[PDB]
Amino acid sequence: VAQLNVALDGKTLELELDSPAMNLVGFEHAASTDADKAAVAKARAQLEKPLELFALPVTAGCSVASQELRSPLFADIHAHYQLSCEKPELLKLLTLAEFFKRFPATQKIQVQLIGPDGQKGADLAPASAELKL
């Protein structure tokens, strides 16, 4: 099951995704064939656009401060993002609805949120894809 760790402290939003490869690339083995490699390139193109993948509200004025994608396919996939948000008070809701639409193999995401107010935990699925920040 894919894990998403979210930290929000002041204007800094951190996202850490750790997933089995199957959820994102559609197979669970090394990428040897041309077909396997194309499926990894498709996933990677989606992971390179975090504001789109995690549907961050444009109103919050988020931009990518840093991004690191790690996998032997590039089998686990790790994606770390640091976002700088001009108006973090406008991040009210994390929605994984775009994530489930771009990675339809993903049935479940376990989300852990941490911030000055404490920890919050939820199992997100295409049916209920939203966590109140």
TrEMBL record:
Domain of life: Bacteria
Keyword list, A-Z: Signal
Disulfide bonds: C62-C85
Entry protein name: DUF2796 domain-containing protein
Species the sequence originates in: Pseudomonas aeruginosa (strain ATCC 15692 / DSM 22644 / CIP 104116 / JCM 14847 / LMG 12228 / 1C / PRS 101 / PAO1)
Species lineage: Bacteria, Pseudomonadati, Pseudomonadota, Gammaproteobacteria, Pseudomonadales
Part of the intact protein present: 37 to 196 of 196
